[PDB]
Design an enzyme around this catalytic site. Sequence first.
Site, mmCIF file in Angstrom:
data_model
loop_
_atom_site.group_PDB
_atom_site.id
_atom_site.type_symbol
_atom_site.label_atom_id
_atom_site.label_comp_id
_atom_site.label_asym_id
_atom_site.label_seq_id
_atom_site.Cartn_x
_atom_site.Cartn_y
_atom_site.Cartn_z
ATOM 1 C CG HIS B 18 -1.633 -1.223 1.386
ATOM 2 N ND1 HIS B 18 -2.821 -1.568 0.341
ATOM 3 C CD2 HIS B 18 -1.575 -2.424 2.205
ATOM 4 C CE1 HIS B 18 -3.238 -2.660 0.786
ATOM 5 N NE2 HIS B 18 -2.584 -3.267 1.797
ATOM 6 C CE1 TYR B 139 -14.578 35.159 -8.888
ATOM 7 C CE2 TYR B 139 -15.444 37.407 -9.379
ATOM 8 C CZ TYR B 139 -15.595 36.110 -9.493
ATOM 9 O OH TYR B 139 -16.485 35.496 -10.163
ATOM 10 C CE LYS B 143 -15.892 34.514 -13.067
ATOM 11 N NZ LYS B 143 -16.403 33.510 -14.076
#
EC number: 3.1.-.-
Lengths: 195, 195
Positions: B18, B139, B143
Amino acid sequence: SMAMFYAHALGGYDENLHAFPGISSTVANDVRKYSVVSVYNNKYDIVKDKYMWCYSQVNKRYIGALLPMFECNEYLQIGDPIHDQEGNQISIITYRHKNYYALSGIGYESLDLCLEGVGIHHHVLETGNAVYGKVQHDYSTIKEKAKEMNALSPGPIIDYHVWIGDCICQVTAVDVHGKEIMRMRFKKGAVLPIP
Amino acid sequence: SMAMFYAHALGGYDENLHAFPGISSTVANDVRKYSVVSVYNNKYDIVKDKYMWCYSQVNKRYIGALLPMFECNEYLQIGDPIHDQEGNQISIITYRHKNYYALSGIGYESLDLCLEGVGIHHHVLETGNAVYGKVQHDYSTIKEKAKEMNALSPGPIIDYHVWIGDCICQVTAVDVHGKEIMRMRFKKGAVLPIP
Ligand SMILES: Nc1nc(=O)c2ncn([C@@H]3O[C@H](CO)[C@@H](O)[C@H]3OP(=O)(O)OC[C@H]3O[C@@H](n4cnc5c(N)ncnc54)[C@H](O)[C@@H]3OP(=O)(O)O)c2[nH]1
Ligand SMILES: Nc1nc(=O)c2ncn([C@@H]3O[C@H](CO)[C@@H](O)[C@H]3OP(=O)(O)OC[C@H]3O[C@@H](n4cnc5c(N)ncnc54)[C@H](O)[C@@H]3OP(=O)(O)O)c2[nH]1
């Protein structure tokens, strides 16, 4: 000014607005925090610890995410306003799975893609199965498949595969030989929408 | 017989075992359920609601995940066993961030990659910033950048970028033009290890 919500299924995608599965909106509501929602004077409970994998494909752009969902036995129409417990609209009806409806907005784990040149496919992940690339099987079969593909050199991604299971969700990408180029795992259980 | 744990940093990667960040093991422990662990008969508290993005790169394979972490002022050595409260070994010391230590195993959201041909880069996501492709900004800037790149045709992925923030983590992939081909979001806050 009034918060607007436009349904992608009704041709409402606008690149200038916030983008969620099935919704372009002038506001960005974090819908993870709601335990109760309202539609037309009726209250519905958000399901705990199970979600809905929702996606829309608009303008060669894939917008997918794990969303909260609520149980409602009545029929609700796409675009119907969803309200919080203070009368504010927070979303609109988008996707459904039998008696469960998605609450779309800023939700949980998400996947966004540029769809030109690659394909994407959605699968129900059977419980107890492991995932490699474009296949799902028991652990030993998957482990042997992965070791076999270890000899191959990786090629460009041509397809994405979304695996939605009761305890986990995964997204894999494969080349033309089926070799797994990428694997992301979302540690949440979910369902897919039923059209 | 006995659960074995091998540190990748000590050359212990084995494709047959694993695979978790920094560990190849004969067992697969779900380490999400622990709130307290023991190292050398001393108990430490698992941090609530903040995690550590850990990764190892072994045999052209990237193995990353959001892992629980615990606060410990004592010095712990790579490979030292981590126990539960009942004295069972569940992990080994791997990654550290000042006084926080990762608990590696089956953890939270994960990313696995084939490293041949593509690069991967890790960034601290500044609070309040949005992400597009290989950049992070406010932001409006993001954008505007996204709309500019919307005209370009997507090319093949050449680089992945991992964004670790106080409230969210993201992974993006870019082509040679900087266009965002893919975005995944993990809705958890985290830190990166310090070497
Ligand atoms: N949609 C969405 N789902 C989530 O689950 C989520 N979790 C956090 N955030 C952040 O909330 C702020 C705004 O509320 C943003 O800072 C956003 O950070 P970010 O998630 O870091 O992405 C920067 C913008 O950039 C956007 N773009 C990405 N690609 C394009 C494109 N081709 N055209 C136009 N816009 C694009 C991307 O959608 C995005 O803008 P939008 O909110 O308007 O959707 C989310 N946003
Ligand atoms: N490592 C790991 N981290 C997690 O966060 C996690 N969450 C759930 N699971 C599941 O636990 C079962 C086994 O405990 C598996 O069903 C696994 O579901 P899956 O994650 O769907 O299975 C793909 C297997 O296949 C493995 N492979 C993937 N690529 C390779 C490769 N090149 N060589 C060898 N093995 C490869 C992949 O690592 C993996 O197997 P390993 O546990 O042995 O690591 C996890 N496993």
